[PDB]
CSV table of C-alpha atoms and ligand atoms in Angstrom, one decimal:
chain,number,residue,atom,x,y,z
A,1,UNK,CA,0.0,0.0,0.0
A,2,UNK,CA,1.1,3.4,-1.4
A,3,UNK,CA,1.6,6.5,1.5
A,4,UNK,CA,-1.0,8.9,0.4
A,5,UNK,CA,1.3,12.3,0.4
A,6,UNK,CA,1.9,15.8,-2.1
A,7,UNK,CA,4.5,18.1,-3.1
A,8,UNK,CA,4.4,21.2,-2.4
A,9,UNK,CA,6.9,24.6,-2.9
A,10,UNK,CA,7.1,27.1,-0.5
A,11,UNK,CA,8.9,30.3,-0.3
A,12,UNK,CA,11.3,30.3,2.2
A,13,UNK,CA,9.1,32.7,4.7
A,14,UNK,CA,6.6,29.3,4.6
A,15,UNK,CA,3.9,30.5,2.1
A,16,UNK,CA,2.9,27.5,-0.6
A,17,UNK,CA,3.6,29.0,-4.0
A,18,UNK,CA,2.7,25.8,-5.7
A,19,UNK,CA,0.5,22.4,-4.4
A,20,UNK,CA,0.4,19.2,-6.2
A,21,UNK,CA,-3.3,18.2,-6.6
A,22,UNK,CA,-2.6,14.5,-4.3
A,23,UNK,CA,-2.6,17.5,-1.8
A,24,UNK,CA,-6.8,16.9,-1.8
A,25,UNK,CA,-7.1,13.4,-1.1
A,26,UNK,CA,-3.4,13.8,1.9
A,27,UNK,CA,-5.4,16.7,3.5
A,28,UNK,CA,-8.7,17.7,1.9
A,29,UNK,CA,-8.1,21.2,0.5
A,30,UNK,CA,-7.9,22.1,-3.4
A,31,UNK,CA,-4.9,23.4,-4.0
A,32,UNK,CA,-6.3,27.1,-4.4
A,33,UNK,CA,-7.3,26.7,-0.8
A,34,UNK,CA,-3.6,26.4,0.1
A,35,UNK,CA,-1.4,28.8,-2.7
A,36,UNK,CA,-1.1,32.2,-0.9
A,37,UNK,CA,-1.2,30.7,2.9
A,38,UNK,CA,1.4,30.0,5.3
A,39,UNK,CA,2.3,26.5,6.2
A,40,UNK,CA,2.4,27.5,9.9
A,41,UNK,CA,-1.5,28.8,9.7
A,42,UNK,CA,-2.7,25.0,9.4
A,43,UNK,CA,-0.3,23.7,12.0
A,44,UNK,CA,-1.1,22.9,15.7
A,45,UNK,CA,-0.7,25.6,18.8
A,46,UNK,CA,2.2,22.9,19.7
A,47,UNK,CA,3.7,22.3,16.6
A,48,UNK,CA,4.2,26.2,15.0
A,49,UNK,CA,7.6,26.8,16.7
A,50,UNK,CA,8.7,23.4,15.6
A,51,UNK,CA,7.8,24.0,12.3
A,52,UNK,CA,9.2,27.7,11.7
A,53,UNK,CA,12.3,26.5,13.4
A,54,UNK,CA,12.3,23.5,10.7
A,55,UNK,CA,11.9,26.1,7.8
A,56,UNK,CA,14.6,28.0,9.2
A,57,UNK,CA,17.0,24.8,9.9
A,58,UNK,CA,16.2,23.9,6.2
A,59,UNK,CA,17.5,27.2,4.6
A,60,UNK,CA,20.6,26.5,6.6
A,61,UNK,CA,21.1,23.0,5.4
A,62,UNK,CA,21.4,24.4,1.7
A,63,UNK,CA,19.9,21.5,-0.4
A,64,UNK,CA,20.2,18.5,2.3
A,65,UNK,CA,17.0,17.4,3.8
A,66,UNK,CA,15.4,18.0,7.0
A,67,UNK,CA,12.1,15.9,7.9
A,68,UNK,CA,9.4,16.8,10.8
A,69,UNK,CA,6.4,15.4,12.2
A,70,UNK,CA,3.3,18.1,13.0
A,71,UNK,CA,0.0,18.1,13.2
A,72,UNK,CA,-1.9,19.9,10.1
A,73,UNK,CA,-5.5,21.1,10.2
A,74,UNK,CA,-7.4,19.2,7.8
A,75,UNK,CA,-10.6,20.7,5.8
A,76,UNK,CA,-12.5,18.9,8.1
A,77,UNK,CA,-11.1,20.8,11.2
A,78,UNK,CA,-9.5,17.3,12.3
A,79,UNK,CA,-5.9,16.8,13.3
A,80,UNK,CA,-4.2,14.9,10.8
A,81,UNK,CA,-0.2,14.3,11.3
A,82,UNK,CA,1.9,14.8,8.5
A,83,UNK,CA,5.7,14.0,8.0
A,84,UNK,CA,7.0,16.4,5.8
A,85,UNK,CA,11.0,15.9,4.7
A,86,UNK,CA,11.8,19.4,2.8
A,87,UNK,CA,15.1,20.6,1.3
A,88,UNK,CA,15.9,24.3,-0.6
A,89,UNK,CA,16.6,24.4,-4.6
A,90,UNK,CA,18.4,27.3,-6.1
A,91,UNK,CA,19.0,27.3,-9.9
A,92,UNK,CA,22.7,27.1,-10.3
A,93,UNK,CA,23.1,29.6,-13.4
A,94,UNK,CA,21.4,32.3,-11.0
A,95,UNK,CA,21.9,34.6,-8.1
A,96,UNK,CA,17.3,34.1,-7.9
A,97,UNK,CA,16.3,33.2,-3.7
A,98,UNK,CA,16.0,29.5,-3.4
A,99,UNK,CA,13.0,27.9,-2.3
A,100,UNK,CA,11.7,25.3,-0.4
A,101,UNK,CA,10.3,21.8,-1.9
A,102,UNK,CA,8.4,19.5,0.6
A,103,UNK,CA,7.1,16.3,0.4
A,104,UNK,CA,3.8,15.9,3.0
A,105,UNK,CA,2.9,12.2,3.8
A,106,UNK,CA,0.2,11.4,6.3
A,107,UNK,CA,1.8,9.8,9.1
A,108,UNK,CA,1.1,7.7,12.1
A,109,UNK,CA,1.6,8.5,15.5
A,110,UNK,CA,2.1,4.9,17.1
A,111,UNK,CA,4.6,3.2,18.6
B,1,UNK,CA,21.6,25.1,-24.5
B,2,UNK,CA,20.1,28.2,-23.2
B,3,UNK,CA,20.7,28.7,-19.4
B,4,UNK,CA,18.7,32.1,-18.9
B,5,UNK,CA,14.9,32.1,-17.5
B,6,UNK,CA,15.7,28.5,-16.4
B,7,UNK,CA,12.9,29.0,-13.3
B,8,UNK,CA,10.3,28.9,-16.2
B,9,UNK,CA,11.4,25.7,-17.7
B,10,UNK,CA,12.1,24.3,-14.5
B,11,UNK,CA,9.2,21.2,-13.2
B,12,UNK,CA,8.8,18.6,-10.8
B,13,UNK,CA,9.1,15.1,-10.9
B,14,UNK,CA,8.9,12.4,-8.2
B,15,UNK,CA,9.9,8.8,-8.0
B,16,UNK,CA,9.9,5.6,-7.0
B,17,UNK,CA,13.4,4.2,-5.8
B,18,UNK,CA,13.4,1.3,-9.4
B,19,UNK,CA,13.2,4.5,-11.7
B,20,UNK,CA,9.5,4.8,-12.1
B,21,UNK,CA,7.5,8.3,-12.6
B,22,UNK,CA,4.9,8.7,-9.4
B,23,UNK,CA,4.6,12.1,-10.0
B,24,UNK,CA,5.0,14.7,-12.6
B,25,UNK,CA,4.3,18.4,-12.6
B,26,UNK,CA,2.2,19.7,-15.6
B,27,UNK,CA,4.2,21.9,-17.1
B,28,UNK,CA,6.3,19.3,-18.6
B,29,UNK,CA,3.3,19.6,-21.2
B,30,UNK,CA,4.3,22.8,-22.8
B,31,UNK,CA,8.1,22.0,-22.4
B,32,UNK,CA,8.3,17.8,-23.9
B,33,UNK,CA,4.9,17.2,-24.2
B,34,UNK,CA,4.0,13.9,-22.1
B,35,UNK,CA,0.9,14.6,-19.9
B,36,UNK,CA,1.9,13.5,-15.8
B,37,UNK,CA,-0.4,10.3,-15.7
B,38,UNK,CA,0.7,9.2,-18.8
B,39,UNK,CA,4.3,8.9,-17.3
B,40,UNK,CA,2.7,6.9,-14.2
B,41,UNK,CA,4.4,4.0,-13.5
B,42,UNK,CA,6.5,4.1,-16.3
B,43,UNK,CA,10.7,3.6,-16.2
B,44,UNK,CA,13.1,6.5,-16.8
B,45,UNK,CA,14.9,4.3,-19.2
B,46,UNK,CA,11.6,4.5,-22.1
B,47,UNK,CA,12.8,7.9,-21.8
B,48,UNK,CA,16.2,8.6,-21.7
B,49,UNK,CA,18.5,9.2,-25.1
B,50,UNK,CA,20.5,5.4,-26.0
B,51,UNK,CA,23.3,8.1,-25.9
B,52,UNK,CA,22.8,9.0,-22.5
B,53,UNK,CA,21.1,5.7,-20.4
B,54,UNK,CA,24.3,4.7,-19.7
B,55,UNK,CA,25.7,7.5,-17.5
B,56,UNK,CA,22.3,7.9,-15.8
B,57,UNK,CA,22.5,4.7,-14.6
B,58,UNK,CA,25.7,5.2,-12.7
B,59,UNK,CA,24.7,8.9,-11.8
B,60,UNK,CA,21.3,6.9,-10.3
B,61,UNK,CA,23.7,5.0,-8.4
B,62,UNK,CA,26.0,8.2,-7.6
B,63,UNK,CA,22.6,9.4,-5.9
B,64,UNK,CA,21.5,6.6,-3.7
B,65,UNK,CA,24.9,7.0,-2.6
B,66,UNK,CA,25.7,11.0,-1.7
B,67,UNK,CA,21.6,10.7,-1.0
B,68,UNK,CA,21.8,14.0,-3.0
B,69,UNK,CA,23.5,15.0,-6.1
B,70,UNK,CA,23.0,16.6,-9.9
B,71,UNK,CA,22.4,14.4,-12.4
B,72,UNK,CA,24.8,15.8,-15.3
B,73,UNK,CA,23.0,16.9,-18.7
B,74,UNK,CA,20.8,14.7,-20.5
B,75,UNK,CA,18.6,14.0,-22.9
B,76,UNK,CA,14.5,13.5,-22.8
B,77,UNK,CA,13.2,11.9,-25.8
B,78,UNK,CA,10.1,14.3,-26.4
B,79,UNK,CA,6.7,13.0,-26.7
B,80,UNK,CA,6.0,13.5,-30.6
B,81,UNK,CA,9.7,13.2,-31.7
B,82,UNK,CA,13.6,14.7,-31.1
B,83,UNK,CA,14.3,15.4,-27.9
B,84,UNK,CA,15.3,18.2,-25.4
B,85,UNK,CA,18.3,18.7,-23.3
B,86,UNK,CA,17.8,18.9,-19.7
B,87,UNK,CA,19.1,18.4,-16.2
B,88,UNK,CA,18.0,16.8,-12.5
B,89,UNK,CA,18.9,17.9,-9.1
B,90,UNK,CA,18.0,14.8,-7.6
B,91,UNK,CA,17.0,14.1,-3.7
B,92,UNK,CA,16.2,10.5,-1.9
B,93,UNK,CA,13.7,11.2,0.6
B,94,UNK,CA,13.7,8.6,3.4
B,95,UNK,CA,11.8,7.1,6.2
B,96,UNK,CA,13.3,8.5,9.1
B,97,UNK,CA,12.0,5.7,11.6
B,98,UNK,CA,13.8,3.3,9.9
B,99,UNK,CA,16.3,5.3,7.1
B,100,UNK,CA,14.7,3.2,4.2
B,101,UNK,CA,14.0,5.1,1.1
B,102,UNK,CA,10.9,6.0,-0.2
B,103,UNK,CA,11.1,8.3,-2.9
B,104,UNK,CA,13.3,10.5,-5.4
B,105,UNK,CA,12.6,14.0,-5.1
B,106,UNK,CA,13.7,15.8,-8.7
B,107,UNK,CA,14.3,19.3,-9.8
B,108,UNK,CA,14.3,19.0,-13.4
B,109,UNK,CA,15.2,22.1,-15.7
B,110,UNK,CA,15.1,22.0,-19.3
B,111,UNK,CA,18.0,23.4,-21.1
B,112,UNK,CA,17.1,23.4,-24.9
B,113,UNK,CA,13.9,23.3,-27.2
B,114,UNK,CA,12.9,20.5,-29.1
B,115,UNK,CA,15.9,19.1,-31.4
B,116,UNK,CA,16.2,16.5,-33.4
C,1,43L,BR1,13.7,10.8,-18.6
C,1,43L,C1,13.5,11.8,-16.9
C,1,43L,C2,13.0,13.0,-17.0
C,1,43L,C3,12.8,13.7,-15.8
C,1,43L,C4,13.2,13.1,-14.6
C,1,43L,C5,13.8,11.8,-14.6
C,1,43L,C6,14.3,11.1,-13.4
C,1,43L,C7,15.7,11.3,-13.0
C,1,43L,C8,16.2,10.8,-11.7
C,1,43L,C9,17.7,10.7,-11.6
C,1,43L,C10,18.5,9.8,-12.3
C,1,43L,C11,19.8,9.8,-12.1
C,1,43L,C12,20.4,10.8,-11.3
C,1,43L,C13,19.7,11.7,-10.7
C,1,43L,BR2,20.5,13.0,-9.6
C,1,43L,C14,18.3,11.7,-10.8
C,1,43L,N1,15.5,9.5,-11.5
C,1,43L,N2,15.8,8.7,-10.5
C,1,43L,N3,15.0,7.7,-10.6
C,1,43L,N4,14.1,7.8,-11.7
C,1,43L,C15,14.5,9.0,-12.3
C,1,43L,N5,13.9,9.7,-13.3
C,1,43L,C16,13.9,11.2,-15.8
């Protein structure tokens, strides 16, 4: 059985600049729903530090990848957990700001 | 090859760890002309230039390895003939609970128009 997960690009302040469509079946929103908005505002009150400090780690890591596992608000208000392992692209012939590529699987929280 | 306004020719591509598509951005439409579920499934290597199969195979290997690395230009045969020069930044994504891989993460930009 396949992990149900999306890609998505964010700038590296956290806002989704592109959402692949798997996005609605990992998490319930279109992908309209998500361009424009800030990872952080669909991530719980205990998770948001964790996951700005994991945005920030990743722009440090300068292409390696950095994985974390939050809890994301779903479009049916329920608490889904995600692993998301992200790493930054720059384009080599270029001086342009990199950004941020994630991969969001839903996860299990079980021992 | 044309290395200015690469961001626009630039799309995503993800894949399983035995060279298969799982995931392709739409815009390689407009730039080779293969729609993403038509890829589904299929191997790199129904793809690739005979010229070039070769050295992606050990750059495939080169990137299991590093976990990370670029894949050196090559060529995408285009959907409706010739081909187009291109290249990968390519990323294995693993399971951190046990460090198996799971996926290839690509950066693909497209460094030429349609040749033959
Ligand atoms: Br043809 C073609 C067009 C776009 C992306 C691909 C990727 C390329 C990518 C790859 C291969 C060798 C080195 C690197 Br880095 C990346 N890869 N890994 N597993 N399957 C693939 N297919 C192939």
């Amino acid at each position: 059985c396949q992990p149900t997960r999306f890609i998505s690009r964010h700038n590296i302040e956290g806002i989704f600049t592109f959402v692949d469509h798997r996005c609605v079946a990992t998490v319930g929103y279109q992908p309209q729903e998500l361009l424009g908005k800030n990872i952080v505002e669909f991530c719980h009150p205990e998770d948001q530090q964790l996951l700005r400090d994991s945005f920030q780690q990743v722009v440090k890591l300068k292409g390696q990848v950095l994985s974390v596992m939050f809890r994301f608000r779903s479009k049916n208000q329920e608490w889904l957990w995600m692993r998301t392992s992200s790493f930054t692209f720059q384009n080599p012939y270029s001086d342009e700001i990199e950004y941020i590529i994630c991969t969001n699987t839903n996860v299990k929280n079980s021992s | 090859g044309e290395f200015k306004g690469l961001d626009s020719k630039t799309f995503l591509s993800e894949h399983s760890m035995d060279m298969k598509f799982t995931y392709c951005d739409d815009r390689i439409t407009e730039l080779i002309g293969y729609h993403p579920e038509e890829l589904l499934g299929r191997s790199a290597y129904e793809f690739y230039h005979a010229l070039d199969s070769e050295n992606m195979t050990k750059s495939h290997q080169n990137l299991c390895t590093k976990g990370q690395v670029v894949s050196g230009q090559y060529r995408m045969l285009a959907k409706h003939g010739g081909y187009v020069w291109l290249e990968t930044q390519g990323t294995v994504i693993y399971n951190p609970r046990n460090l198996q891989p799971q996926c290839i993460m690509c950066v693909n930009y497209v460094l030429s128009e349609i040749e033959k």
